[PDB]
């Protein structure tokens, strides 16, 4: 009753602080970009008298609508390819059960919305057992690798607490290279994103936030290799279980900090 | 090891089946839609001879360069509202720590992307601490309300397992009216969405999927009331805990089905 109110106050303060920081970091640039395209549009109207202000704003608005829906407004004909072909439909099904939900592909039909509701109600807990199994498989593999070292070093194990500590340290160090650093390097070369855009995609994907602004394997102008789609699929599958384990440890550290605050305030 | 492979096979089959169903339900409708920006752009060039193809291409490319990083909900891109005013920046901060991430508002700047990475790393576990407390608060409140029912159930010599099952189903039934049915009725009248679109929004939001195709409080053409934004904020906050408890019960039902 009192602990839940204390954490609610901390979360509200964290949200207000975050809102103030994100506004200071984004609003002046957004205001600069809004006036920048506004002046270019106003000059376009005086250079091209045959076009009226509404006529131009209709095409510009529709160009933005097509771009945000996956169809590039640059070039002669884009053909729009297919968002619901068996391959992309399988990947869409994954964005639902994993709770990432990029939103680049989403059901328009009534049948798709009805099926999506039931698909997430039974699929999300089903994926959670696979994620618990993968986390256990990773912990058992890392536990075996630490037990082999403790056998060759001739150290007597009083309890599996020493193995648990060493395996958590090696897990977050090695796992950061395998699921965070190396993938971002691949995304920089394949997608052509910046070093920051690539690392921003990894965190947003593995934390299940999935804004949809950056999606690996979604550029029509890029001919992706045969191994690329299944590699990203396997990276999300295991990388979600890695990030969930790291975020669980961070949650424990915050719970430990709460007991220190309780003791100091008492 | 063998258990993990068995669940992986089930998940892959569930994904392939889902892919086949979503393709059959969406691909024929997608193939029917012939409206494209390429034909509208080609017609624009013949209607306005004073503009050349490269002159139009230049303005269209610059419009995309000046566009926000977020993809606005379906049918709400011509709003031109400030995506980063204190109010909508507070709501954006919520989409990160709750893991919903609609993506209607998203950081374009380098400073925003760096801060968003650290904001998610420390904010998501912080919100989890709160969600655990809210789930406990819901369980205690429900437990107090059902204590009269459990007293009558215990009087008639009913086993403690039978009482546990009936109580959990009553949590889903009352909780569905409070966090699923009543909110969807409000979204139908306020947003003007269909009965299905409103229920589709609720499930996608409370399961933290958050596609971004439907966002409550994102229509420029609708003048929202003063109480609307904080009501949706409070519904998301406590509704996530109810849905996490329900999804946990669904997982238990699947484990029971496995023993059968």
């Amino acid at each position, epitope marked *: 009753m009192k602990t839940v109110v204390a954490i609610f106050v901390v979360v509200v303060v964290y949200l207000v602080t975050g809102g103030l920081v994100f506004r200071a970091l984004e609003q002046p640039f957004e205001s600069s970009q809004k006036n920048t395209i506004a002046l270019e549009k106003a000059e376009f109207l005086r250079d091209h008298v045959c076009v009226s202000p509404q006529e131009l704003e209709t095409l510009i608005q529709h160009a933005l609508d097509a771009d945000n829906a996956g169809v590039s407004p640059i070039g002669q004909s884009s053909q729009q390819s297919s968002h619901w072909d068996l391959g992309s439909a399988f990947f869409f099904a994954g964005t639902v059960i994993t709770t990432i939900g990029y939103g680049n592909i989403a059901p328009s039909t009534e049948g798709g919305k009805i099926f999506c509701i039931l698909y997430a109600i039974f699929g999300i807990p089903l994926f959670g057992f696979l994620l618990a199994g993968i*986390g256990d498989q990773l912990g058992t593999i890392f536990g075996k690798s630490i037990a082999r070292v403790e056998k060759v070093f001739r150290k007597k194990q009083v*309890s*599996q607490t020493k193995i*648990r500590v060493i395996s958590t340290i090696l897990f977050i160090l090695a796992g950061c290279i395998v699921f965070v650093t190396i993938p971002a390097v691949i995304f920089k070369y394949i997608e052509g994103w910046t070093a920051l855009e690539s690392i921003y995609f990894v965190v947003v994907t593995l934390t299940t936030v999935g804004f949809g602004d950056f999606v690996a394997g979604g550029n029509a102008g890029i001919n992706y290799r045969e191994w690329y789609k299944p590699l990203v699929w396997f990276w999300i599958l295991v990388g979600l279980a890695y990030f969930a384990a790291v975020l669980s440890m961070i*949650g*424990d550290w915050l*719970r430990v900090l709460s*007991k220190k605050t309780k003791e100091e305030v008492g | 090891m063998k258990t993990v492979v068995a669940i992986f096979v089930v998940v892959v089959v569930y994904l392939v089946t889902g892919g086949l169903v979503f393709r059959a339900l969406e691909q024929p409708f997608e193939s029917s839609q012939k409206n494209t920006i390429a034909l509208e752009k080609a017609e624009f060039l013949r209607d306005h001879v004073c503009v050349s193809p490269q002159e139009l291409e230049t303005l269209i490319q610059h419009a995309l360069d000046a566009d926000n990083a977020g993809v606005s909900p379906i049918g709400q891109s011509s709003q031109q509202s400030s995506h980063w005013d204190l109010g909508s920046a507070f709501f954006f901060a919520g989409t990160v720590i709750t893991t919903i991430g609609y993506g209607n508002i998203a950081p374009s700047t380098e400073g925003g992307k760096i801060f968003c990475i650290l904001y998610a790393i420390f904010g998501i576990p912080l919100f989890g601490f709160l969600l655990a407390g809210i789930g406990d608060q819901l369980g205690t409140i429900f437990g107090k309300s059902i204590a009269r029912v459990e007293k009558v159930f215990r009087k008639k010599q009913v086993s403690q397992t039978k009482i546990r099952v009936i109580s959990t189903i009553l949590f889903i039934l009352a909780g569905c009216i409070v966090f699923v049915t009543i909110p969807a009725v409000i979204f139908k009248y306020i947003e003007g969405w269909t009965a299905l679109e409103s229920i589709y929004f609720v499930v996608v939001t409370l399961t933290t999927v958050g596609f971004g195709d439907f966002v409550a409080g994102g229509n420029a053409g609708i003048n929202y009331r003063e109480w609307y934004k904080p009501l949706v904020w409070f519904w998301i906050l406590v509704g996530l805990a109810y849905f996490a408890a329900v999804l946990s019960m669904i997982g238990d039902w699947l484990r029971v089905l496995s023993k059968k």
Partner: nanobody
Amino acid sequence: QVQLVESGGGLVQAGGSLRLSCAASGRAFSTYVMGWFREAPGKERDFVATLSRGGAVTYYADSVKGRFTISRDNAKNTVYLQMDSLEPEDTAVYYCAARDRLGGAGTATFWGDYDYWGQGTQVTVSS
């Protein structure tokens, strides 16, 4: 499904002692975070004590700190709760709980933080 069975409660006079035990089934007890909760009649289940997977990190509620002691024996799949200096306020049904999810070492103080639960053991302290 993991089964938790409690034993060792009863009725004692104020100031006396008790020792509860909770036996678990399966061969993964050493991987669970064990905890004790108590349900007073008409009151919600409150946190009593929690213990890390090995047993080296203990955490207690302010009402039972200095009087109660949580311990574990992974060899016998059992978690214990030694209750010294019992007060009439400690009269409740005590529940044993196991957490197989990662973490929880001293921080698992909510009922929702656990995955498996016991039947409950009655503890009564009279004036």
